[PDB]
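batch job 7 of whatever, protein = Cathepsin B-like peptidase (C01 family)
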Amino acid sequence: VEIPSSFDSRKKWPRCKSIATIRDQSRCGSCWAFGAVEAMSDRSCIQSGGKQNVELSAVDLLSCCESCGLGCEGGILGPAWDYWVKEGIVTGSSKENHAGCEPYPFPKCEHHTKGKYPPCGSKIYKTPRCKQTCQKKYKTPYTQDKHRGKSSYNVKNDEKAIQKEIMKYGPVEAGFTVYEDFLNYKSGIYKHITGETLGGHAIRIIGWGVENKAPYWLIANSWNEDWGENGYFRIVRGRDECSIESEVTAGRIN
Ligand SMILES: *C(=N)N(C)N(C)C(=O)[C@H](CC(C)C)NC(=O)NCc1ccccc1
C-alpha cells in the first residue's frame, strides 16, 4: 500500500481514547512498561474496531512480569509484549484518576523540565509488589480483568516496514539511546548534538511527518504533558537516529 507523507494515529483512530493520552511514569524507571501498556491499549482498541476501549495498567505489568527485568530499575521490551500475550494485563489509570482495576501508585512529577508538577528529582521508588487485586470499588476480579494479545514481535530496522506496521496495526513501542541533550528538549525535531549517553529510553511511536524537508517520527513520551510538545516529541526519521529504528516491538490481538 502507499505510505503517506504524514500519519498520525490520533487522527486515524480517534475513537480510541488511549491514543492521545499522555501518561507519567513518575519517579520509577518503568518507561519500558509505559510504552508497552500505552501501545497495547491503543492496539486493543484499534484491532477490535473500538470494542475494547481501555487503559491498561502500567503497575500490573511493572510489578508482575518477572522476565521483564528490574522493575522501577529498568526493563526489557520483548518480554513485556510476551507477558501481554501469555498472562495479559488488567486495566488501570493514573494515580490522580484512580480508575480501573490497578491504577498507578505514583504521582506526576517533572522530568528535567519546568512546569506545574513537583520535580521528579533523583530518587527512585521501590518496585511495587505484584498484588493481583483490583481496587475496592472496581467490581471485576483481577484475573477476569485481563486483556491478552495473540502475538508479539520485533519490527525490522527498516523505515518503510515501521511505517507500514504503524499505519496498519497502530502505534508501536520503541527503544532509543538517550544522550544528555535529550533532557533539554523543549520542542522541534530532536537529534543528538551534545552530551554523553544516559543509557536508553522506551517510548511509543504514533506516526510521522515532515517539516521544512526534515522527516521525523512523532512520539509520545511518558513524562507528562508539560514535557516537550504537550508530552510528545519529534526525532529525525530515516537515519536510525539514536537507534530509533532498531528497537521497535509490537504485537496484535488477532
Ligand atoms: C525507563 N524508564 N528506563 C529506566 N529504561 C531506560 C529502561 O527500562 C530500559 C528500556 C530499554 C532502553 C528499552 N532498560 C533498562 O534500563 N534496563 C536496565 C539496565 C540496563 C543496562 C544497565 C543497567 C540497567
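notes: The longest strand covers residues 197-211.
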